[PDB]
Short mmCIF file of N, CA, C and O in Angstrom, two decimals:
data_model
loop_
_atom_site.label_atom_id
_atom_site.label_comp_id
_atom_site.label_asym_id
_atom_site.label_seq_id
_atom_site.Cartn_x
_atom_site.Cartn_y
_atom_site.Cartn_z
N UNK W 1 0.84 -1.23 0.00
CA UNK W 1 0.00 0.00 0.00
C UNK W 1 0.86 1.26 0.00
O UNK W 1 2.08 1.20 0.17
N UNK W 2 0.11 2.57 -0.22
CA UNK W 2 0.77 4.00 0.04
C UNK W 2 1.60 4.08 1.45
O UNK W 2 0.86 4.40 2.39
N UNK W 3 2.45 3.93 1.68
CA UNK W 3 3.15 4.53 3.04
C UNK W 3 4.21 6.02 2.69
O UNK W 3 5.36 6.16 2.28
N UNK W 4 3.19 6.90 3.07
CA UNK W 4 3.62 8.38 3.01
C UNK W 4 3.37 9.20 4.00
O UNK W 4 2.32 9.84 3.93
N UNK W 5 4.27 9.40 5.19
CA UNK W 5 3.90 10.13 6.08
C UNK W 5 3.95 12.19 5.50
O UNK W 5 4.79 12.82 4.86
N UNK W 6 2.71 12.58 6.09
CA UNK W 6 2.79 14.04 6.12
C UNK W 6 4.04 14.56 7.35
O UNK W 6 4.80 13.92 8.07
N UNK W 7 3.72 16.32 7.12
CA UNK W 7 4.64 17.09 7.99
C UNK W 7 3.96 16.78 9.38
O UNK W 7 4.76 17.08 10.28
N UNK W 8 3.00 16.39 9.78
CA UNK W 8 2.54 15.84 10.93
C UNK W 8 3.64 14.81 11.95
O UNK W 8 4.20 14.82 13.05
N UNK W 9 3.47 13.67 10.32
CA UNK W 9 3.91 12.34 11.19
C UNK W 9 5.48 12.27 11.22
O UNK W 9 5.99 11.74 12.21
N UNK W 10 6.62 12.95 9.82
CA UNK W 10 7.77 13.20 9.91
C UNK W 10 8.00 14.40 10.38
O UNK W 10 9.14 14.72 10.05
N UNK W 11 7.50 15.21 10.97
CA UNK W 11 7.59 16.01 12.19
C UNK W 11 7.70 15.52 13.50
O UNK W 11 8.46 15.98 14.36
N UNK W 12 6.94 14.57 13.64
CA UNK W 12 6.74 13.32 15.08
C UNK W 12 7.93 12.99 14.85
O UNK W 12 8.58 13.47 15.78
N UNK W 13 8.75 12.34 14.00
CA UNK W 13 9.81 11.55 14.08
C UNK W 13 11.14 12.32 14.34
O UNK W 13 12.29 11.89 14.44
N UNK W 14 10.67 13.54 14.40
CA UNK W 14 11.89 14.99 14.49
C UNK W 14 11.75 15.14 16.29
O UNK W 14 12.69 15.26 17.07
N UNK W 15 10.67 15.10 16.55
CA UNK W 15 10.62 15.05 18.31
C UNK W 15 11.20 14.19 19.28
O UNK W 15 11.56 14.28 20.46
N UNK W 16 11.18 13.14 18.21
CA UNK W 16 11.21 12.03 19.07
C UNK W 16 13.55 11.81 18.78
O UNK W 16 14.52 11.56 19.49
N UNK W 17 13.37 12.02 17.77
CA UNK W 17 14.71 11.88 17.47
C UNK W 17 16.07 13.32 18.05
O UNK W 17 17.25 13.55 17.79
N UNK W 18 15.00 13.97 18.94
CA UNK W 18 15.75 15.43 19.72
C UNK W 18 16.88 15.89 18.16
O UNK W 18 18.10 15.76 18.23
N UNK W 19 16.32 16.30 17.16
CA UNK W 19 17.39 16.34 15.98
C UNK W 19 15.96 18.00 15.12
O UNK W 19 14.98 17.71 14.44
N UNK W 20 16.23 18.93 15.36
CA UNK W 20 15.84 20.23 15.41
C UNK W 20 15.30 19.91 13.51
O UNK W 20 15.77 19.13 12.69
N UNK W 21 14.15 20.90 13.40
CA UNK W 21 13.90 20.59 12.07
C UNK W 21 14.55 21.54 10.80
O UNK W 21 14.30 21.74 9.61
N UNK W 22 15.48 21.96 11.78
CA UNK W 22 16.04 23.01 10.67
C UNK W 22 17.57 22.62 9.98
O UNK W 22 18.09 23.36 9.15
N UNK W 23 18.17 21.44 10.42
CA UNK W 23 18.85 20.41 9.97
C UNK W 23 18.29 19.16 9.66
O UNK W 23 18.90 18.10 9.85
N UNK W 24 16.94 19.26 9.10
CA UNK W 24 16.53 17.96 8.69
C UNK W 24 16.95 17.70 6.95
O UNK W 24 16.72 18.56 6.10
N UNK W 25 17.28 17.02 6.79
CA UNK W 25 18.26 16.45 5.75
C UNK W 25 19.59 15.27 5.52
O UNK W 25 20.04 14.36 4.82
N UNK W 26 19.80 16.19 6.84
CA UNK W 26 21.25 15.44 6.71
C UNK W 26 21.56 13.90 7.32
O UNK W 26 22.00 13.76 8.46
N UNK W 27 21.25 12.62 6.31
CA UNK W 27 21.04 11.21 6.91
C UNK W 27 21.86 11.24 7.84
O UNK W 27 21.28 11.07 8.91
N UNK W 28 23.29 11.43 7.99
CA UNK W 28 23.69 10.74 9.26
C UNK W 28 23.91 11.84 10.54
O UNK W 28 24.76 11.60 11.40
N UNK W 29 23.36 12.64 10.57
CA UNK W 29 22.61 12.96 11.76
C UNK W 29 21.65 12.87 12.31
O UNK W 29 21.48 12.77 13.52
N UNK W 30 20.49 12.92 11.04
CA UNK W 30 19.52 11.94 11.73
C UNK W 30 19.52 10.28 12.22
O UNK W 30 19.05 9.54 13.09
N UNK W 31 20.29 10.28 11.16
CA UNK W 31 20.18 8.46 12.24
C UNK W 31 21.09 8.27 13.25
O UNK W 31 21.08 7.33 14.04
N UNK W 32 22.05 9.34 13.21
CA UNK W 32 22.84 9.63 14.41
C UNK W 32 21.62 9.48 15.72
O UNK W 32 21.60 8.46 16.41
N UNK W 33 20.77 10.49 15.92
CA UNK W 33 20.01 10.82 16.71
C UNK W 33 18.81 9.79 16.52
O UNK W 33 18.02 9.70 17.45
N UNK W 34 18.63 9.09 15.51
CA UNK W 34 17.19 7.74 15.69
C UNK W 34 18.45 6.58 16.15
O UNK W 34 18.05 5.42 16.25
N UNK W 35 19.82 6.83 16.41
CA UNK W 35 20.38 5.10 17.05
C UNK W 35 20.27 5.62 18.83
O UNK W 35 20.24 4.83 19.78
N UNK W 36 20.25 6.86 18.89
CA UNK W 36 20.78 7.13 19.92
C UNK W 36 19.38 6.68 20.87
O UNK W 36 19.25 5.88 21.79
N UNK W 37 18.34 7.67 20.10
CA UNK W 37 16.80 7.51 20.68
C UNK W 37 16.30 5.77 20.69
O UNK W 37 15.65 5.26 21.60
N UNK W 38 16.73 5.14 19.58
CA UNK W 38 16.01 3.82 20.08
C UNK W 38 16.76 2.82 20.76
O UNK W 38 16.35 1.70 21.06
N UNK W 39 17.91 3.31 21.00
CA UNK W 39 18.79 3.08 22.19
C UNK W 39 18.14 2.93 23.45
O UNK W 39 18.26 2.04 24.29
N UNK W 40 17.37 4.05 23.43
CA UNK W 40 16.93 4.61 25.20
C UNK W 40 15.46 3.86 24.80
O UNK W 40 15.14 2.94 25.55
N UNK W 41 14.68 4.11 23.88
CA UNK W 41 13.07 3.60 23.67
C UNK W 41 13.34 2.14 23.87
O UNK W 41 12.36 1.40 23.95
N UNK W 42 14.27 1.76 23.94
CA UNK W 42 14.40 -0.25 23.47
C UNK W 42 13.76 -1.03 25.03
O UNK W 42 14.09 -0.36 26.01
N UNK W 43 13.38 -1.60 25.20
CA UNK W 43 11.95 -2.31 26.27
C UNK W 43 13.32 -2.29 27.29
O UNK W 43 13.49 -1.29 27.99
N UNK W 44 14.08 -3.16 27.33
CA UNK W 44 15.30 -3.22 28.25
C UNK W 44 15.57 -2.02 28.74
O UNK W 44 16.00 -2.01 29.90
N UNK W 45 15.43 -0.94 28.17
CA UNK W 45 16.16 0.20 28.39
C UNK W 45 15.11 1.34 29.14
O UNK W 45 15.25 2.43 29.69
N UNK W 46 13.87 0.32 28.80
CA UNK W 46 12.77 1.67 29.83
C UNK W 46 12.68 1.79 29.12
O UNK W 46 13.48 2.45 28.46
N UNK W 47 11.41 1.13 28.50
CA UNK W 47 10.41 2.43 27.36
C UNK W 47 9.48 2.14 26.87
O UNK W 47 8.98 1.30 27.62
N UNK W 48 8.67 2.33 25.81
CA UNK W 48 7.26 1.76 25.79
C UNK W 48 7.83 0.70 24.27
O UNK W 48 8.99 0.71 23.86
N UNK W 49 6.95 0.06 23.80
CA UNK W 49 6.71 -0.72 22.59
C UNK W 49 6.06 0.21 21.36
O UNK W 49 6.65 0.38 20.29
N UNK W 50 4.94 0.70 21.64
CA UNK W 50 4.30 1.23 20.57
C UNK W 50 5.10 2.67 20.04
O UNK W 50 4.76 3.38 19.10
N UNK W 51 6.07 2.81 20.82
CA UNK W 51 6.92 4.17 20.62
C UNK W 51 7.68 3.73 19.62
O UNK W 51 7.49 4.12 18.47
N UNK W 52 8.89 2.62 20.02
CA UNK W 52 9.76 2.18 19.09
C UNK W 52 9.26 1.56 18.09
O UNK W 52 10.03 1.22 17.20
N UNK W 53 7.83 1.26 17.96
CA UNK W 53 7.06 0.67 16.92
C UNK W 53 6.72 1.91 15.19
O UNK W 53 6.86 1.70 13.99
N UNK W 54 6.36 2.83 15.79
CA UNK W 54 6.05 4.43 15.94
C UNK W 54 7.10 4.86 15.21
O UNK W 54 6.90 4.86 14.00
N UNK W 55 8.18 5.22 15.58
CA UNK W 55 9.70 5.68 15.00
C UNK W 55 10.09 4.72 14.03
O UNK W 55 10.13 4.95 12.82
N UNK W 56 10.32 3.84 14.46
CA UNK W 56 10.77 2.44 13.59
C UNK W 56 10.04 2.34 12.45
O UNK W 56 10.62 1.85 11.48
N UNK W 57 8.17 2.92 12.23
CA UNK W 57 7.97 2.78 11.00
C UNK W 57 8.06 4.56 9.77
O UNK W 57 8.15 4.85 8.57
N UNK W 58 7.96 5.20 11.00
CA UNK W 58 7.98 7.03 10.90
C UNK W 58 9.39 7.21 9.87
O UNK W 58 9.67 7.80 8.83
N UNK W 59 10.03 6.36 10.81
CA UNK W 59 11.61 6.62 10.16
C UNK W 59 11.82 5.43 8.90
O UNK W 59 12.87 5.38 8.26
N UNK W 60 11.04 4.81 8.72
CA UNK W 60 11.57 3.67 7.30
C UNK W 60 10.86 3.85 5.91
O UNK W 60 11.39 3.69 4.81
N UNK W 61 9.48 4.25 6.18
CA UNK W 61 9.00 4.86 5.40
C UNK W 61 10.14 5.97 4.54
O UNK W 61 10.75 6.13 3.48
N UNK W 62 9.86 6.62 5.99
CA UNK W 62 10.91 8.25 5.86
C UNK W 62 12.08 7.54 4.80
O UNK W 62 12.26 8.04 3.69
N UNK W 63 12.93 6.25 5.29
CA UNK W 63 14.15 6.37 4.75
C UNK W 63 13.60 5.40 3.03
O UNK W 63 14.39 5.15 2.12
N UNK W 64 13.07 5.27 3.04
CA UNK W 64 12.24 4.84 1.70
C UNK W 64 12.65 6.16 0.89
O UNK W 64 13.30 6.07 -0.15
N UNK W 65 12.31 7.16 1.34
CA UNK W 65 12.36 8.43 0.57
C UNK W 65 13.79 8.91 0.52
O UNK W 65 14.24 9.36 -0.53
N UNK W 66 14.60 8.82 1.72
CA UNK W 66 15.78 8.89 2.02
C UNK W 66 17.05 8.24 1.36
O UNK W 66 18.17 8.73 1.27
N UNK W 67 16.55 6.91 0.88
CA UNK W 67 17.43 6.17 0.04
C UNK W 67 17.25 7.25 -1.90
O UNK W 67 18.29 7.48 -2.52
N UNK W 68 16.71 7.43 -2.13
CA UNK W 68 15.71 8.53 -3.39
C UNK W 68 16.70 10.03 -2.99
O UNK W 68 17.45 10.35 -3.92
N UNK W 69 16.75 10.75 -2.01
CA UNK W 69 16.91 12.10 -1.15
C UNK W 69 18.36 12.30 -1.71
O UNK W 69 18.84 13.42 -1.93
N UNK W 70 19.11 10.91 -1.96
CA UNK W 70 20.78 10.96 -2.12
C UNK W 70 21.08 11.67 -3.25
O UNK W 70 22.11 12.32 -3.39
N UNK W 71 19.96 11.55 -4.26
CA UNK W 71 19.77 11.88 -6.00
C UNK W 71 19.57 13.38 -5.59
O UNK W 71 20.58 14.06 -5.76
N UNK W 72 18.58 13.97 -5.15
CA UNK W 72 18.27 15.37 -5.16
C UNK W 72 19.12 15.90 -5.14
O UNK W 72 19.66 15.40 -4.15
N UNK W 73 19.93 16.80 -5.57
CA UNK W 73 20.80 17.96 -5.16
C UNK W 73 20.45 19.57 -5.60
O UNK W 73 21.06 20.61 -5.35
N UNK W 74 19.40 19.36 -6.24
CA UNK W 74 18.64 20.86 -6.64
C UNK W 74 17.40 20.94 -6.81
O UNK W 74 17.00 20.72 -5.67
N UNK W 75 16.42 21.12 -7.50
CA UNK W 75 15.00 21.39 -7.26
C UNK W 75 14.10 21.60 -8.37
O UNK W 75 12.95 21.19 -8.19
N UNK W 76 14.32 22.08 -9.34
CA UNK W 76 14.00 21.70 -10.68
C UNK W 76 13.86 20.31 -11.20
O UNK W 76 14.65 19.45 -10.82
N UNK W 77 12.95 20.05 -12.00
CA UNK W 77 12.78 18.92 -12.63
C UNK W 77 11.07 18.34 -12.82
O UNK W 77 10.40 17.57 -12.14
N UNK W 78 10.82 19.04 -13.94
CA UNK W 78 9.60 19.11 -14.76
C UNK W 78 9.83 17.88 -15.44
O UNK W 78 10.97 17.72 -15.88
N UNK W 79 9.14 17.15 -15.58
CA UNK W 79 8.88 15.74 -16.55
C UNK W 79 7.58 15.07 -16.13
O UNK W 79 7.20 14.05 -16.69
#
């Protein structure tokens, strides 16, 4: 099916990942900050299930687009 999160739900994944939305772009700071966060969310570690459930799909989706994101380097492109 469609898995496309809005600025809602990859906004959620910016909260949760303490990683400010005004450096959102840059993969390995964000996953810098999603190893660090599901580090601490992981059940062993104190934390809930449906959270790391939550991120884990917020962020794969996300990197669905992210693996694609590497190509962009400008903004044009009518076809």
């Amino acid at each position: 099916m469609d898995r496309v999160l809005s600025r809602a739900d990859k906004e959620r994944l910016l909260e949760l990942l303490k990683l400010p939305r005004q450096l959102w772009g840059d993969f390995g700071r964000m996953q810098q900050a999603y190893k660090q966060q599901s580090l601490l969310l992981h059940p062993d570690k104190g934390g809930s299930h449906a959270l790391m459930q939550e991120l884990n799909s917020l962020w794969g989706t996300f990197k669905t687009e992210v693996y694609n994101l590497r190509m962009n380097l400008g903004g044009t492109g009518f076809q």
